[PDB]
Amino acid sequence: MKYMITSKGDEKSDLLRLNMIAGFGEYDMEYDDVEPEIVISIGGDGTFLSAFHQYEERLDEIAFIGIHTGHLGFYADWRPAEADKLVKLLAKGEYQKVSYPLLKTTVKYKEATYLALNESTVKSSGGPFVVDVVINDIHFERFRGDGLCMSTPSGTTAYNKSLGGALMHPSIEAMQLTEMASINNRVYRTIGSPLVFPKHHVVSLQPVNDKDFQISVDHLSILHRDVQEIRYEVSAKKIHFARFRSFPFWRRVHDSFIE
Amino acid sequence: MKYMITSKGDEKSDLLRLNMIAGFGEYDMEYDDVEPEIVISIGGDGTFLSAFHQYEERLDEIAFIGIHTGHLGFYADWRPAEADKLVKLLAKGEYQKVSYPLLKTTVKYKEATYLALNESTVKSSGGPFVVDVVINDIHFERFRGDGLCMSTPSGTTAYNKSLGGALMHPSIEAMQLTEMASINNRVYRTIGSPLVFPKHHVVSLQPVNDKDFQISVDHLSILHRDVQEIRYEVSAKKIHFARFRSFPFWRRVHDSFIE
Amino acid sequence: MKYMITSKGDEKSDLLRLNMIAGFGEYDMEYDDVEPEIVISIGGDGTFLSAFHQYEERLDEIAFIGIHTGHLGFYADWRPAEADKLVKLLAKGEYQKVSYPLLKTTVKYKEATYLALNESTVKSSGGPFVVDVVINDIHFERFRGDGLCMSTPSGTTAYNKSLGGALMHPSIEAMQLTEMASINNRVYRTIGSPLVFPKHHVVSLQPVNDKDFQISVDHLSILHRDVQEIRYEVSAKKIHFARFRSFPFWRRVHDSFIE
Amino acid sequence: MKYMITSKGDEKSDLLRLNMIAGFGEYDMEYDDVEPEIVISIGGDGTFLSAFHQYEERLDEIAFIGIHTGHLGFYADWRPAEADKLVKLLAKGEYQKVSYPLLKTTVKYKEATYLALNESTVKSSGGPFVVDVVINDIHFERFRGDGLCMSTPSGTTAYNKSLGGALMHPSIEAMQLTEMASINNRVYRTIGSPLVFPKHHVVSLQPVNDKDFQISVDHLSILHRDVQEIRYEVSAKKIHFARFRSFPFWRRVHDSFIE
Ligand SMILES: CN(CC#Cc1nc2c(N)ncnc2n1[C@@H]1O[C@H](CNC(=O)Nc2ccccc2)[C@@H](O)[C@H]1O)C[C@H]1O[C@@H](n2cnc3c(N)ncnc32)[C@H](O)[C@@H]1O
Ligand SMILES: CN(CC#Cc1nc2c(N)ncnc2n1[C@@H]1O[C@H](CNC(=O)Nc2ccccc2)[C@@H](O)[C@H]1O)C[C@H]1O[C@@H](n2cnc3c(N)ncnc32)[C@H](O)[C@@H]1O
Ligand SMILES: CN(CC#Cc1nc2c(N)ncnc2n1[C@@H]1O[C@H](CNC(=O)Nc2ccccc2)[C@@H](O)[C@H]1O)C[C@H]1O[C@@H](n2cnc3c(N)ncnc32)[C@H](O)[C@@H]1O
Ligand SMILES: CN(CC#Cc1nc2c(N)ncnc2n1[C@@H]1O[C@H](CNC(=O)Nc2ccccc2)[C@@H](O)[C@H]1O)C[C@H]1O[C@@H](n2cnc3c(N)ncnc32)[C@H](O)[C@@H]1O
């Protein structure tokens, strides 16, 4: 079945890529990097992120797999040594799909939308960052700090985690807002805690004075000018993973942070 | 319809209780404190917690209402002044039910189960608190600290919040584990972050040496002796609230912590 | 005695400035904004910061006073209403000096030094921020995160505080390092806690790959290119405040954050 | 010179103790466990703490040494293998003393004082912990939470650290107050940050309703009844360490938490 493979582009990963394509040739898997059904990423979670964004308009039609040739990532949860086995099962099919939820960011000025697999962050360009925070059309706080991070479930082990966010199991359809260094006094008062929103809640940010912001989607950082609204909601689209064995998420969490 | 009313027992709340019963008499609402269908709590969230536990084996059959005669609580979200209106709508019916998820704690030695509306905490009796933490039969960390807090969604604004937990919207069926003062070194290593578990995940705690613990369920604190396991999971039972108007949770969060 | 007065430049503060100069004329206080002995700042702590930096090469020879025409600052701890009294005592002299410690930042490429009254921060320009941290020539950690904040004692109620830093009483001659969003895994491991250094300790930062950084001294933000070292130490210079009455620091802390 | 040696009392440490005494016999060091001049502790920091408290009325007259037969402690910073060298230099003298500051806790009801090397903590007995906090006779906050920890400089790597306290270099004469799980709302408002006090500041705690508390001094936990005041200040007494080589504190910090 159609397939494509992306590489971190160092020596170790380019080699492993050519050996996989050859093994795929020993079945009749048609390489197509235009309409693949299976997208294999080789290197690190960053490489995987790029694989996801390279194909984010065909999400409902692709199964992604991560192979970490550096250290384990959360998306790249295959060692190189397991490559030949991968190719094998990947050919026979009879594999299962798991879907993780995604984050839609909408930026009104026209109107542009982004899909994040880790998180969408907002900071200020130059001046201090001051936005009013609106939850389902309800004014909640006036945030003054360094910025805000909206994380997916699988993104909570990433940036979110470093911001003191909670770690969330990916089957939960939600989004998590973490503060970045809010000032807090009788004047300026924010909630502090990470907030965790369900499906269909719209978290909307509204600027007070400066209208320019730096928006980051999975480490891509766009500068946006003359901003009127940023809207976060849990996306309707989901990413699909090819699952060949049990690698529970909490097991994955353990190996990356405890031992 | 059958009903009962609980009081904080200070002067302000006992009065408001008698005036509500009289107004109920002006309809024909039968007071029954043995099999009520509607349980009204008057005072603070503590009073409400007690109302919930007084009737925790008939949860599937009761709608609770909170009236705060002190400061707003999260469960007691009615001012006294609105009492006469309450009685009124409470009589005609045609009100809606909202259900919040609950937490089951199971303590094996026989075996005892508890239902929490805020959270179930564990501390040590005397000695240091050391348990191994097991997630769906997966050894995750060996925790050494002051203790652990497992919070419901609606409990995340309570103890959980003070432990740096995330605030969670109550429609989300989950449970949140917050650490209490873990020691962290090359020897002892815990995750740090609040962890947030879905339905059907069982978080199980297993003692290393000392076997005695102080377990707290909604501020009730039992000492347990010769403990073999503590098991947390999202309960199948839910609590039901009578809803007469919109008081969104995030609105409720705003009023209690921001302004 | 020679004196000068700086203004936030809104209407309220310019007026108060002219009325003070007139009152000074009713004594014979020579206005000199080139070699003042007394520097009065009118507006907010920001205005005061600017007053300090406008005269940072004559620190050993100036007493600063803050008047807050907005909300109380930590440096601007005089209400406008007290202005006429201020002028009065300011004329007779017989006032006491308090000195707060300062922070020297040294940036080697030539070599440039900065004096901070609040803090010196470092972030990355574009890429991720990765420096090795060296304490008295001892390699301590390899920090990978958003950045680092080195705060003075009186600066600990400022940025430092929002970064989870400790609040420090200003008579203590020290400097405090707070992390900004470190990544932590088996690979990358930082201390986490705020660190608090004494006099004569040199905290030195050393870049790993990217050599460009954004350095902030009291909210002035310079971009520095081809950086070889950043060195923090407690400065030998001190700032002097004119003290006319008791306004203890902890009292000051209480009014700004508790009530 | 007079000397004594304390043991964790497991097999490894009792042996090492007898071999040191024999080596001391090969000089003429008089063993005296009543008036030693040198107190050697063998095991872990806990063992060392006990050695300190066993001799806390002769502090101005004893040099302590720690040997860790488990893992390195902060006070037990000698490996067993270095024992014979220790004995040697310990005999010739010509060693240097370093002194770390200590914490005095005063508990008025009569009046009892305690000396801590790590920290003095306060919790409640049964009920919720509510004290007013007074700094040099200035009412600062009304704390409602799980408790409070007052840490020495060298204690900041201990409990203090787990409470989010800052790590402090021991030459700094100060004390650090960390909160334990304060509730924070418009009603109850505490500072949050660790506070760091200098010499001569008296931090005094005053109970609101319940008067019983559990006070912990270096993990000794006394229950105190009918309490009127707890007073913390930096002690006039200091502990003295025998220093035979450079083991800088920050180096010590690195080895225990980073690598
Ligand atoms: C360039 N990245 C690729 C990714 C990813 C990533 N996904 C996840 C995930 N789902 N769950 C768990 N771990 C993850 N990883 C891991 O992170 C390290 C890779 N990347 C960073 O090292 N980046 C970085 C950025 C700035 C400062 C310091 C570090 C590896 O171990 C990966 O496996 C982008 C991602 O960087 C995160 N990010 C941004 N700022 C961060 C910060 N201050 N602290 C921690 N993370 C931060 C964020 O999520 C962004 O999308
Ligand atoms: C006796 N309580 C009754 C309750 C509740 C309660 N529910 C919630 C909730 N769903 N969401 C938001 N707020 C809540 N409230 C609010 O809390 C204050 C009432 N109670 C406390 O003041 N108790 C306390 C206990 C120890 C130390 C300091 C304070 C009011 O404002 C209520 O409206 C029991 C609950 O106490 C929580 N608890 C325990 N230790 C805590 C700590 N260290 N910090 C913060 N909370 C702590 C916990 O959830 C326990 O079940
Ligand atoms: C432009 N400032 C002037 C100052 C100062 C200042 N000194 C102190 C101090 N000794 N002790 C206590 N409070 C202080 N203030 C108070 O701070 C508010 C003023 N300024 C900010 O609002 N600035 C800001 C910046 C970015 C994002 C949000 C807020 C008033 O109330 C002042 O009285 C510069 C100072 O901004 C601090 N800063 C930077 N980033 C921060 C952040 N994320 N959170 C909190 N502070 C941050 C930092 O110290 C910088 O030097
Ligand atoms: C019985 N101890 C002896 C001691 C000490 C000690 N001194 C220091 C120090 N100057 N600097 C750095 N590390 C230190 N150590 C290290 O701590 C571990 C030993 N002890 C604990 O494991 N005790 C414990 C208690 C409750 C829950 C979990 C752990 C070793 O590695 C030692 O080398 C008493 C000390 O226990 C601290 N303590 C209390 N509660 C704590 C908590 N929740 N988290 C972290 N520490 C906590 C506190 O300072 C008390 O005095």
Tab-separated table of N, CA, C and O in Angstrom, chain A residues 71-72 123 128 146 159 161-163 180-187 189 219 255-257 259, chain C residues 71-72 123 128 146 159 161-163 180-187 189 219 255-257 259:
chain	number	residue	atom	x	y	z
A	71	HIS	N	17.118	9.559	20.882
A	71	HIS	CA	16.402	9.048	22.026
A	71	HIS	C	14.926	8.961	21.716
A	71	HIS	O	14.397	9.715	20.874
A	72	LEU	N	14.286	7.999	22.389
A	72	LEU	CA	12.856	7.825	22.324
A	72	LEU	C	12.176	9.193	22.350
A	72	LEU	O	12.573	10.090	23.078
A	123	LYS	N	3.014	34.595	22.286
A	123	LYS	CA	3.771	35.547	23.053
A	123	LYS	C	3.615	36.900	22.408
A	123	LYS	O	2.983	37.046	21.357
A	128	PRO	N	4.933	44.147	26.372
A	128	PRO	CA	4.402	43.162	27.308
A	128	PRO	C	3.167	42.516	26.727
A	128	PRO	O	2.439	43.105	25.919
A	146	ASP	N	4.394	36.554	30.364
A	146	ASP	CA	5.190	36.258	29.178
A	146	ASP	C	4.384	35.595	28.067
A	146	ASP	O	4.671	35.825	26.885
A	159	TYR	N	6.045	20.975	25.943
A	159	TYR	CA	6.098	22.309	26.514
A	159	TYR	C	5.206	22.453	27.735
A	159	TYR	O	5.639	22.937	28.790
A	161	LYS	N	4.267	20.481	29.916
A	161	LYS	CA	4.854	19.903	31.122
A	161	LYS	C	5.837	20.866	31.778
A	161	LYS	O	5.799	21.070	32.997
A	162	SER	N	6.740	21.457	30.984
A	162	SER	CA	7.698	22.420	31.523
A	162	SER	C	7.028	23.648	32.103
A	162	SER	O	7.640	24.344	32.917
A	163	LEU	N	5.820	23.972	31.667
A	163	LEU	CA	5.114	25.099	32.243
A	163	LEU	C	4.313	24.698	33.469
A	163	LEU	O	3.445	25.457	33.912
A	180	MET	N	2.379	31.419	31.253
A	180	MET	CA	3.815	31.705	31.233
A	180	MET	C	4.043	32.984	32.035
A	180	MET	O	3.839	34.084	31.511
A	181	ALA	N	4.449	32.842	33.296
A	181	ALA	CA	4.978	33.940	34.113
A	181	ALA	C	4.017	35.128	34.205
A	181	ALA	O	4.337	36.252	33.814
A	182	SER	N	2.841	34.877	34.768
A	182	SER	CA	1.889	35.954	35.000
A	182	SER	C	2.351	36.820	36.160
A	182	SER	O	2.934	36.327	37.129
A	183	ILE	N	2.109	38.111	36.051
A	183	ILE	CA	2.312	38.986	37.189
A	183	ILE	C	1.052	38.885	38.035
A	183	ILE	O	-0.054	38.781	37.493
A	184	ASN	N	1.185	38.831	39.354
A	184	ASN	CA	-0.018	38.752	40.174
A	184	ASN	C	0.058	39.707	41.350
A	184	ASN	O	0.956	39.605	42.192
A	185	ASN	N	-0.909	40.615	41.400
A	185	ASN	CA	-1.052	41.603	42.454
A	185	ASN	C	-2.528	41.974	42.537
A	185	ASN	O	-3.339	41.539	41.720
A	186	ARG	N	-2.884	42.784	43.535
A	186	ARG	CA	-4.269	43.237	43.654
A	186	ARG	C	-4.804	43.773	42.324
A	186	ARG	O	-5.998	43.660	42.037
A	187	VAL	N	-3.913	44.333	41.504
A	187	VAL	CA	-4.254	44.924	40.206
A	187	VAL	C	-4.512	43.856	39.170
A	187	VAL	O	-5.499	43.887	38.424
A	189	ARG	N	-4.615	39.856	38.329
A	189	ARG	CA	-4.936	38.651	39.060
A	189	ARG	C	-5.300	37.616	38.019
A	189	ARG	O	-6.224	37.829	37.232
A	219	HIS	N	6.249	24.585	17.300
A	219	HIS	CA	7.570	25.171	17.191
A	219	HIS	C	7.761	25.937	15.906
A	219	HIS	O	8.910	26.403	15.644
A	255	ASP	N	9.297	5.732	30.948
A	255	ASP	CA	10.622	5.541	30.379
A	255	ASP	C	11.296	6.874	30.079
A	255	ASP	O	12.525	6.976	30.165
A	256	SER	N	10.512	7.913	29.772
A	256	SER	CA	11.088	9.199	29.395
A	256	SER	C	11.468	10.066	30.596
A	256	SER	O	12.347	10.923	30.470
A	257	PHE	N	10.837	9.892	31.759
A	257	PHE	CA	11.096	10.828	32.852
A	257	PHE	C	11.588	10.188	34.153
A	257	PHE	O	12.322	10.842	34.891
A	259	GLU	N	12.919	6.486	34.694
A	259	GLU	CA	14.042	5.552	34.646
A	259	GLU	C	14.391	5.196	33.201
A	259	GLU	O	13.997	4.149	32.692
C	71	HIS	N	-0.315	53.195	41.093
C	71	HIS	CA	-0.303	52.352	42.265
C	71	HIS	C	1.093	52.285	42.840
C	71	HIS	O	2.097	52.446	42.117
C	72	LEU	N	1.126	52.081	44.160
C	72	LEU	CA	2.356	51.871	44.883
C	72	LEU	C	3.276	50.965	44.066
C	72	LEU	O	2.845	50.001	43.454
C	123	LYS	N	17.581	35.452	27.216
C	123	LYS	CA	16.832	34.516	26.421
C	123	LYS	C	17.577	34.295	25.130
C	123	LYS	O	18.610	34.919	24.864
C	128	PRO	N	16.545	27.598	20.227
C	128	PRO	CA	16.367	27.218	21.624
C	128	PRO	C	17.529	27.724	22.445
C	128	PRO	O	18.651	27.894	21.955
C	146	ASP	N	13.440	28.183	28.221
C	146	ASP	CA	13.176	29.502	27.656
C	146	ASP	C	14.184	30.555	28.100
C	146	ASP	O	14.493	31.469	27.324
C	159	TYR	N	10.014	40.350	38.477
C	159	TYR	CA	10.057	39.199	37.593
C	159	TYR	C	10.352	37.908	38.335
C	159	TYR	O	9.648	36.901	38.173
C	161	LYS	N	9.756	36.929	41.201
C	161	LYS	CA	8.591	36.393	41.899
C	161	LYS	C	7.695	35.599	40.956
C	161	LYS	O	7.262	34.489	41.287
C	162	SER	N	7.392	36.160	39.779
C	162	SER	CA	6.567	35.454	38.800
C	162	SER	C	7.209	34.173	38.312
C	162	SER	O	6.504	33.297	37.806
C	163	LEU	N	8.527	34.059	38.387
C	163	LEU	CA	9.177	32.824	37.995
C	163	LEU	C	9.255	31.837	39.145
C	163	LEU	O	10.012	30.863	39.069
C	180	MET	N	13.545	29.647	33.611
C	180	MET	CA	12.374	29.868	32.762
C	180	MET	C	12.153	28.602	31.939
C	180	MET	O	12.825	28.404	30.922
C	181	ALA	N	11.229	27.749	32.380
C	181	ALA	CA	10.694	26.640	31.583
C	181	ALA	C	11.786	25.704	31.057
C	181	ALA	O	11.952	25.515	29.851
C	182	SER	N	12.510	25.085	31.983
C	182	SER	CA	13.508	24.097	31.600
C	182	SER	C	12.829	22.812	31.156
C	182	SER	O	11.788	22.425	31.692
C	183	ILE	N	13.406	22.166	30.163
C	183	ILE	CA	12.962	20.831	29.812
C	183	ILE	C	13.677	19.881	30.763
C	183	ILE	O	14.845	20.103	31.102
C	184	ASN	N	12.988	18.866	31.270
C	184	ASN	CA	13.669	17.942	32.169
C	184	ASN	C	13.341	16.502	31.821
C	184	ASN	O	12.176	16.091	31.856
C	185	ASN	N	14.387	15.746	31.511
C	185	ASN	CA	14.310	14.334	31.182
C	185	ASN	C	15.653	13.707	31.538
C	185	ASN	O	16.597	14.399	31.914
C	186	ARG	N	15.740	12.381	31.422
C	186	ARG	CA	17.009	11.704	31.687
C	186	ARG	C	18.171	12.374	30.953
C	186	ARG	O	19.305	12.371	31.438
C	187	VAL	N	17.881	12.971	29.794
C	187	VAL	CA	18.875	13.635	28.945
C	187	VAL	C	19.275	14.975	29.517
C	187	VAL	O	20.458	15.322	29.615
C	189	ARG	N	18.729	17.728	32.490
C	189	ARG	CA	18.400	17.683	33.896
C	189	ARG	C	18.902	18.983	34.484
C	189	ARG	O	20.094	19.284	34.391
C	219	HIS	N	14.396	45.557	32.039
C	219	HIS	CA	13.437	45.667	30.958
C	219	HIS	C	14.005	46.361	29.746
C	219	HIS	O	13.230	46.616	28.775
C	255	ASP	N	1.282	45.053	51.500
C	255	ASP	CA	0.321	45.945	50.870
C	255	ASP	C	0.192	45.660	49.379
C	255	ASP	O	-0.890	45.841	48.808
C	256	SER	N	1.262	45.171	48.743
C	256	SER	CA	1.239	44.949	47.301
C	256	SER	C	0.614	43.610	46.908
C	256	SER	O	0.114	43.482	45.786
C	257	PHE	N	0.627	42.596	47.776
C	257	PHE	CA	0.170	41.280	47.334
C	257	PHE	C	-0.968	40.676	48.160
C	257	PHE	O	-1.758	39.914	47.607
C	259	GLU	N	-3.275	42.502	50.827
C	259	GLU	CA	-4.465	43.309	51.094
C	259	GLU	C	-4.244	44.760	50.667
C	259	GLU	O	-3.944	45.625	51.486
